[PDB]
Every structure is written in structure tokens, then in C-alpha cells.
Amino acid sequence: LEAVAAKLITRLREAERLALEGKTSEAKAILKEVLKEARERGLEKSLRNLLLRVKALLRR
Amino acid sequence: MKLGAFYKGGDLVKPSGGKKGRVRKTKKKALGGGPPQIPKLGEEDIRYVERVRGGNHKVRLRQARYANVYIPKERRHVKAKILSIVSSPSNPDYARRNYIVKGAIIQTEVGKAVVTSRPGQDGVINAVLI
Amino acid sequence: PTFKLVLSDPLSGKARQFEIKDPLAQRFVGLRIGEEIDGTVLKELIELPKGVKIRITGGSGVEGAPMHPGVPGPVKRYILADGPPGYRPRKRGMRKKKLVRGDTITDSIVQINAVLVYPEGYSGPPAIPLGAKELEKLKG
Amino acid sequence: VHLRKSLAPYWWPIPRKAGGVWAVRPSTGPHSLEYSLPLAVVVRDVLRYAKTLREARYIISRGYIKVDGVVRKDYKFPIGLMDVVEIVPTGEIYRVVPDEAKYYDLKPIPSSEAALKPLRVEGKTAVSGGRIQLHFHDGRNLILPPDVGRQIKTFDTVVYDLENKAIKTHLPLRLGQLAVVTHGGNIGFVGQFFEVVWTLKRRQSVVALRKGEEVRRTILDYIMVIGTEAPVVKIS
RNA sequence: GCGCACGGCUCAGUAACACGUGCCUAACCUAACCUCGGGAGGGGGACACCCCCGGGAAACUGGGGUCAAUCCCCCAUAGGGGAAGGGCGCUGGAAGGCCCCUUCCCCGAAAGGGCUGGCGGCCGAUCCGCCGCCAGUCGCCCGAGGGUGGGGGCACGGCCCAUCAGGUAGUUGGCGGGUUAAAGGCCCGCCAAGCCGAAGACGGGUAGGGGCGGUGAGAGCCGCGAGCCCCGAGAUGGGCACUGAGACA
Ligand SMILES: [Mg+2]
Ligand SMILES: [Mg+2]
Ligand SMILES: [Mg+2]
Ligand SMILES: [Mg+2]
Ligand SMILES: [Mg+2]
Ligand SMILES: [Mg+2]
Ligand SMILES: [Mg+2]
Ligand SMILES: [Mg+2]
Ligand SMILES: [Mg+2]
Ligand SMILES: [Mg+2]
Ligand SMILES: [Mg+2]
């Protein structure tokens, strides 16, 4: 599970950097399938601080 | 400020010289005072804004370098520089320690001026040339 | 001296709790708050990629007192606290006398707070991608 | 802030002993505490529409009560001299007027004079722009240009339009007008102004009023001019 | 955010501007509220709850991550303060005040935020919002006045003892300053010898002051002047500060 989470956290942080530069759709692209991936493994709550930050970045 | 160390309440002495008791045990904060804040002659101007009674504000000059000297004979205002404090008639110990008070003489760039504001209360040195 | 290290990963938001002992224990004593020690010291406890230096962020003593960065040296002290670091005021302007400890570590500290400092430009995976209790609860 | 029942004003229409130890305290509105009555007292005592304080607050909380064209939803709002109180769902209007018995009374008035309020000039101040500000007997203000405000001296009564924020009519204080005493023992009396002993302080001048031929005297501070032989608006 | 400085208790200190009556602040501050006039533009940040870990007996408390504001901060303009010269004008009994003009120095606002309805646009059921406008309503900032609360000042009134007769030396006043929201030996630098007293100083004793209460036919005497109301002071003794409109709570 640490393997799946490390890339997930890596993919969550990378989209965060994209959202700061104005690329909302591609960042929304990353946030989407990470949401697909964490839902069926029960890792949504584990990444709760990061999903909260990402949507705040896109909502700007 | 309102500090009990600088209490401005009444004396405990009658005009006859006799002593009287204390009607109130504590020192009221409304009757409190504060330490002096008159500026000292320094290489740059430093101003401090202080919150006072009623949520008001008072401008304090912690360190004074320029004076708004005004020439009566010419009707012009100059923001001249200050070189030394010539003499303080209220107390020489202000001039002896380079502390500017109202009525003090200052040897400014334009000449001499008499300080015409209360630099601990106004926060600026308004001066009139002699 | 036995320790309960709190190693937190900024890039994953998780913390791993290591218990330092004899060989590394003197590597921590004498260090001030904010210090830089290379992550290879914890190689036998944790794997850290070679761009990370774990940073010293604070800790607590044997009696629960926290270490104060604004107090220097390894000493116990009483302060008239008025702010967050070592005090949580309940009313505005309220100042309280609180017991704290210096930022320089010593034998009486039981909790030591350290955080990983990833290298510049690093974008690899998280050194602590999950919590131990969280992972154990997740598996259960 | 509390108000003990003992410390309540003497003229209030409430029992002095029987009741609680407390009275409703007006919330620093457009009058004086000694000369104002809170809105909850009027709704419960003077109009008797509410039997308790909660019922009075409920009535006020719905905005049913209008005071001088503005709906007051504060149950501690002060009401005083020459104020126009309007009850929206019933359509009744009153003007709190100086009374010979109750000292202050709710008198019904026609709907036409409901927007009008007679205000006594308490003083003027010079404000920025060179304009003049007028202060009235209930603390209300009105800024005017300097020339128009020059001719309105203190104690002059002006009939003020609450609807237009304007001055309908200016009533100077001269000998020979109709005045109503608004404070003191001789309250409620309306008579002709025919005598004055001008003291050093003008506010303390001795003034006499006549009504053929009952003559009452007060100080100049305690009389409002309501016009010539016909009062401009219904007060009695 | 607002309130908790109101409310409740008690009677040690106090013979005093404490209290009462009658006046002042032209020497002052005031959140909430009322009225009139004006304003709401640009840009940033952090910290809780929470999550991953704790430390500690407990009190309490540490590190990393992370979402906001009517939270905090900056920029602009309005405005504000000081010094100086002029004026028709205002208030007021009387201008060291207000207003207008000129010069300089200095400080320096705001939450267009919430709700409701209407319109339109962006966006998406992993969103359930964001944006522009309009109206209604509740709010925010500035100037002036009121209101309320408070700081200060004055005249007079109310105990006993001479087996207490001289007391006072910042003591009394002047000038110049500091501090204060504001006058003042309130404090400080200098100058003088004044200030109080037998119309009783000083010292001692007792006591919270008043509305009032008991008694007597009354004058009067007494305080049961405990309980209720108003003012004062205090929170184990003595001091000193934070926040705040307001406390030295
Ligand atoms: Mg009380
Ligand atoms: Mg933090
Ligand atoms: Mg605010
Ligand atoms: Mg002004
Ligand atoms: Mg600014
Ligand atoms: Mg904002
Ligand atoms: Mg002075
Ligand atoms: Mg003295
Ligand atoms: Mg009792
Ligand atoms: Mg004590
Ligand atoms: Mg205490």
C-alpha cells in the first residue's frame, strides 16, 4: 500500500504545482483519476489533506 | 500610557501640611501616567505610534534627526537637519543628554531655532528660527 | 538516553515515530533547534533518499514541558508566556507563567520533533507515504 | 447595563413598588434617558397590546411599530417629545406630546401630519465646507448652507419633513407666539409668549405664557414655539 | 464577533471632594445606539478544529500537513495631529474652540461582508459552487452632533477630646517643562518664603455618607445609619501590569 500511496502522493503534489501555474484542466485531469484510484483502495481519507489543498488550488 | 509607577492622582497632604488617610486603596488606571518619551538626537528619525485611552493614538518620536524649521522673516518652511542642542531652559539635563523638549534651542543647519512643539506628544519637531 | 523521535514528512503529511537509543543518542545531544543532520544516520531505522537532511523542530521533556526556540541553551526556565510556542491563551492579551525548556537537546527530553528536508528540485515519492497506525487500521 | 425600578424616571406609567426589581432601559437613542420611554414600555403599558415583555418584544420584532417613518425593531428604543409613532397593521398614528397629567402622552393624529415633526433648534455647528449643522431637541442634525443657516437662531422651532429631510416651515422665537411647555412643573400648558426677563444666560431666561388669563412662568429652555394663534400641528 | 468592567456579596480603609445639595469641564475620553454629510478601490498572510505522530501523573503541551472568514497586514485616497500667519463667518455670557485661506512636517480608514429574490455567465452528479449586475434587508469606514458611561474641578453642610498648641519643608506660591484623554506640586529644573492655627491647626479616638429609622404632644434625643434604594471602598495582607471603549479585573 505504501507503493500505491507514494505515487499517489507524488501524483497529487505534481498536479498541485500545475494548478499554481494556471493549468487547471490538466491539474483537474490528474486530480480526477487519483480520485478514481484512492476510492476503491480506501486511501481517500489518507490523502485528505492533499485533496483538500488541490481543490482549493483549482477553485482559485 | 497609564502606568501606576507614574501615578498622577492627588497627594496625601492637606494645605495645612497635615497628613490625610487614603480613601482608595488601589491606584486607578484612569489616573495612571507614563514615562517621558521626548526624542533623543539621532542619525535617523524613528516614530512610534502608541494606543492610548479610548482607543486613540499618539505619535512618539523615539529618535530625532530633522526639524521642520520655519523662517518668520521669509515665511518659508525648511526640513533642516539638527546638529546639537544648544540649551534647555526648563532643565539643562535635557540638553546634557541630547533630549529635545519644547522651548529648547537647537543649532540647526539654517541656524538656531526654539522648539515650538511637544516632541513627546506631537511626535515632530516644529521649530522657529531665532 | 531513550528517545521517542517524531519524524514527519512534509511531502506526505505523515509522521513516523522512531525510538533513538545508545549509538545515535549522542548524535542528537547538543544540537539546537533547526539543525541539519544527514538522513543516513537513520539508515538502520528508515530509508531516506540522498537529498534529505532531517531538521530539528522541537520536542518535549520528561515532565511534558516543550522546548522553546526563543530560549537558548539546555536549561529549564519559567517564562511569562503570551503566545503560541509553549502556551495556548484562552483570552485576548492574557499572559501566563509557563515552564519551558531550552532549544539545546539533553538527556531529559523524551520527545524529539524532526522533519525531513527534501533536496531542492526533488520530486520523487514520499519518504513516509503512510502512517503505521493508519496502515494497520487500513489493513484491518 | 441594568436599570433598577427605583431609578426609573418618576413620570413613567408603571407601578413603583409592585412588579420586578428591574425596568427596561432605553438604548441611548435619539432622546435623553430622563425624557424618553423605551418602546417595549409603550407597547406593554401605554397601548396595552402586550401582556409580558416577551410579547412586547415579539410585536416589536415583527416590525409592526414605526417610529418617525423608520421601522424600529429594537425593544429598547427611546421615544420622546414630538415623536410620531405609527402602528402598521392597525394604521393608528400618535404624536408623543407634552401632557398635563401623564407628563408625555400618545395622542392620535391625522395621517396627513404624520410625516411632519416640529423640532426645536438646540444649537448650530460649523462643519466642513463652510456649511452649518443644526442640532434639534432630540439630537437630530441637519446640515445647511451658511446663509440659510444664518437666519435660524437657537430656540427657533422648525417643522421638519421626515419624508424629504427638509425644513417645511421655520418658526422664530419672538414675543407673541404660541408656545408649549415641554419640561418642568408647568408641562402641558400652551399659551401666548408675552413676557421675558432676559438673563445673562439666555437658556435661563424667565418666560411667561398666557391663556386668558392663566399665566404660567418657566425658563426659556423649557418652551417650544408651536406657531402663532393656530398651532401648526395637532399637539393637544 | 459581542458580552463577561452589568449583575451578586461584604463593611476592613476612609473625618476625605468619600458623601449630600447646588453648579462646572471654554481642561476631557466614550464600544453598543440615534441623526445629518461623505466613502467601501488594489493587493497579501497566518492560526485553530481536522489529519500523521506524540510528550506528561495531571495540569498543560510539541512537530509536520491542510481549508476559511466580518481573522491579521500592506498600498492608495478621504481624513487626522502639530507649528505658524490671516479672516469676513458660527456657537456661546466669554473663544486657546468650530468654519474658511496659506506653509511645512507627521500620522493615516473601511468588511460591499452576510442574507433574500431576479437576471446572465463559468463550471459538473467525483458539482452541488464561483463570477458580473440590480433591488430589499442586516452590516463596515470617515466628519459633526446627541445619547450613555466615566475622569476631573468648585461653593456650602454633617462626629468627640486641649489630661493634644504650635504644625508644615514638595511644605505654600511663581516661572519653564514632562506626563495625561484631560487642569493640577500630579511629577520634574529653577526662584521665593510662603501655607495652616486658638473662628482650634496638629495629634488622638471613633465612624463607610445619604434617602432614612426609633421615641416624644412638641422642641428635641438616639442610631436599632443591620435588612430596602443611591454613592463609596474591598475581594487572605501588600504591590504591579495585559487586553479592552472601559479594569490595574
Ligand atoms: Mg456592582
Ligand atoms: Mg503550522
Ligand atoms: Mg473587523
Ligand atoms: Mg477638527
Ligand atoms: Mg494606508
Ligand atoms: Mg478581505
Ligand atoms: Mg499642560
Ligand atoms: Mg505635594
Ligand atoms: Mg442579604
Ligand atoms: Mg493585597
Ligand atoms: Mg484579582
Side-chain angles (χ1 to χ4, degrees):
Chain A
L1 266 164
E2 316 253 357
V4 317
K7 35 153 302 190
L8 274 182
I9 294 155
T10 281
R11 207 161 307 72
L12 270 191
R13 311 297 191 150
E14 59 198 54
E16 228 184 74
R17 193 177 38 41
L18 316 184
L20 291 158
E21 323 319 0
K23 308 166 299 332
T24 184
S25 157
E26 322 74 331
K28 232 180 108 165
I30 314 196
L31 182 294
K32 275 214 110 73
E33 91 307 317
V34 184
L35 279 199
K36 314 337 181 195
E37 202 176 350
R39 271 229 189 88
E40 80 313 333
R41 301 204 69 141
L43 260 62
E44 250 197 20
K45 173 78 180 179
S46 276
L47 319 193
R48 166 200 99 89
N49 293 321
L50 263 293
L51 308 156
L52 278 171
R53 163 144 202 105
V54 152
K55 316 206 226 93
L57 264 185
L58 283 102
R59 229 65 71 69
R60 171 287 340 293
Chain B
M1 264 277 268
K2 305 307 235 167
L3 292 171
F6 300 90
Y7 190 72
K8 294 164 60 62
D11 230 329
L12 272 195
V13 172
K14 298 198 237 170
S16 73
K19 204 159 28 163
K20 68 194 207 187
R22 214 166 42 172
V23 301
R24 187 177 160 110
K25 156 162 118 184
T26 82
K27 297 184 188 186
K28 304 190 237 289
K29 177 168 196 171
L31 284 187
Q37 321 229 1
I38 55 151
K40 191 184 167 179
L41 211 23
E43 325 164 20
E44 88 206 290
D45 275 318
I46 323 167
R47 288 209 173 69
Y48 170 62
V49 164
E50 190 171 64
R51 178 228 186 263
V52 290
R53 173 111 178 158
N56 280 280
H57 299 287
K58 258 188 218 185
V59 179
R60 261 94 166 78
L61 202 33
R62 303 260 99 200
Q63 177 126 2
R65 147 128 322 295
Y66 302 90
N68 181 52
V69 193
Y70 156 69
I71 331 293
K73 262 162 305 288
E74 164 179 29
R75 254 67 147 150
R76 102 161 164 240
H77 280 255
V78 54
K79 188 199 166 179
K81 205 151 167 159
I82 313 168
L83 303 321
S84 68
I85 303 175
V86 181
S87 59
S88 271
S90 65
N91 186 7
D93 189 40
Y94 294 122
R96 206 179 313 145
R97 304 197 267 113
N98 292 128
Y99 282 100
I100 320 158
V101 299
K102 155 182 200 246
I105 306 296
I106 54 170
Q107 170 78 33
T108 46
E109 301 261 277
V110 310
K112 289 192 283 72
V114 224
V115 192
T116 36
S117 77
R118 286 140 91 229
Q121 309 271 304
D122 316 56
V124 317
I125 289 90
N126 300 322
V128 157
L129 185 119
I130 289 166
Chain C
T2 77
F3 296 116
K4 267 102 71 161
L5 197 167
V6 162
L7 188 82
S8 318
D9 183 279
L11 278 188
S12 133
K14 273 70 172 45
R16 214 49 83 61
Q17 182 154 266
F18 310 97
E19 310 50 54
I20 303 196
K21 279 212 295 166
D22 222 1
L24 325 160
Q26 285 79 27
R27 302 298 73 68
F28 275 46
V29 187
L31 293 163
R32 305 153 29 270
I33 280 198
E35 223 63 288
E36 302 86 352
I37 79 177
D38 185 84
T40 54
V41 55
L42 264 44
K43 202 61 146 184
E44 68 282 50
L45 291 45
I46 196 67
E47 222 289 337
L48 302 139
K50 313 157 262 166
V52 60
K53 285 213 301 318
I54 79 98
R55 185 137 82 57
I56 267 48
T57 39
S60 67
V62 33
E63 70 298 17
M67 315 205 321
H68 192 257
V71 300
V75 67
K76 271 216 283 189
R77 186 137 101 81
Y78 273 106
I79 77 182
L80 188 66
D82 42 24
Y87 179 44
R88 310 288 191 154
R90 312 305 334 310
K91 327 210 171 182
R92 166 169 317 215
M94 204 203 143
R95 304 188 319 176
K96 173 135 167 121
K97 168 140 293 151
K98 278 283 200 201
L99 172 83
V100 299
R101 306 168 84 72
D103 39 26
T104 310
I105 327 172
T106 204
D107 66 336
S108 52
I109 292 95
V110 198
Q111 145 177 100
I112 180 133
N113 295 141
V115 73
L116 312 176
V117 167
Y118 285 116
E120 36 266 24
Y122 173 70
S123 48
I128 306 167
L130 294 143
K133 330 317 199 63
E134 192 178 44
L135 169 61
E136 181 74 311
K137 276 145 74 151
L138 252 275
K139 302 228 175 192
Chain D
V1 50
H2 287 82
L3 176 73
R4 183 88 45 176
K5 216 171 252 228
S6 81
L7 276 171
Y10 188 38
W11 62 267
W12 278 14
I14 75 168
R16 269 313 182 131
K17 268 185 156 175
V21 291
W22 300 119
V24 180
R25 164 153 190 141
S27 299
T28 93
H31 276 294
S32 152
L33 202 172
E34 285 202 350
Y35 306 129
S36 56
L37 196 76
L39 204 58
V41 175
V42 163
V43 183
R44 181 179 46 189
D45 301 53
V46 187
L47 301 179
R48 286 172 276 89
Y49 267 118
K51 290 321 162 271
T52 59
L53 183 271
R54 298 220 205 137
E55 276 165 288
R57 264 166 103 184
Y58 173 80
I59 287 166
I60 287 153
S61 318
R62 311 270 75 72
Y64 288 163
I65 310 305
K66 228 206 266 183
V67 200
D68 317 271
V70 186
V71 164
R72 303 291 166 207
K73 287 192 168 183
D74 182 44
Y75 76 108
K76 314 220 266 174
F77 193 86
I79 330 291
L81 190 78
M82 310 271 159
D83 278 12
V84 173
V85 190
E86 166 190 296
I87 300 183
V88 194
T90 315
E92 34 194 319
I93 326 292
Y94 310 91
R95 200 192 271 294
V96 186
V97 290
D99 181 24
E100 187 162 334
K102 314 260 278 295
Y103 175 89
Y104 262 14
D105 206 16
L106 284 175
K107 291 270 139 295
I109 50 167
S111 273
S112 73
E113 66 210 53
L116 301 178
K117 189 185 171 168
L119 301 167
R120 199 179 59 159
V121 176
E122 261 313 89
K124 313 174 308 200
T125 218
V127 293
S128 97
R131 307 164 298 165
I132 303 270
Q133 193 178 27
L134 253 56
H135 320 304
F136 302 117
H137 71 271
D138 60 343
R140 188 172 312 242
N141 311 299
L142 174 66
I143 297 190
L144 304 179
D147 198 1
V148 42
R150 170 172 326 269
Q151 330 177 36
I152 302 184
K153 320 305 297 213
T154 299
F155 297 116
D156 291 35
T157 297
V158 321
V159 178
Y160 174 83
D161 308 6
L162 310 172
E163 71 287 18
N164 327 305
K165 331 296 196 62
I167 291 169
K168 205 160 135 284
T169 293
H170 165 241
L171 276 51
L173 177 89
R174 29 177 280 290
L175 262 176
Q177 261 153 322
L178 212 74
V180 60
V181 193
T182 66
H183 281 128
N186 290 342
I187 197 143
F189 181 80
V190 173
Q192 204 212 348
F193 194 18
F194 74 105
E195 200 176 53
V196 65
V197 167
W198 290 113
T199 42
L200 183 64
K201 272 247 173 226
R202 283 181 55 93
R203 202 173 283 279
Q204 294 294 327
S205 321
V206 193
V207 304
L209 302 196
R210 154 152 52 63
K211 197 158 32 204
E213 61 268 22
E214 182 45 24
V215 180
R216 321 274 264 262
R217 253 157 310 263
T218 323
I219 48 166
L220 164 61
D221 200 347
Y222 285 154
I223 65 165
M224 167 156 21
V225 177
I226 42 164
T228 317
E229 176 62 299
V232 279
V233 89
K234 168 204 208 230
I235 47 140
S236 178

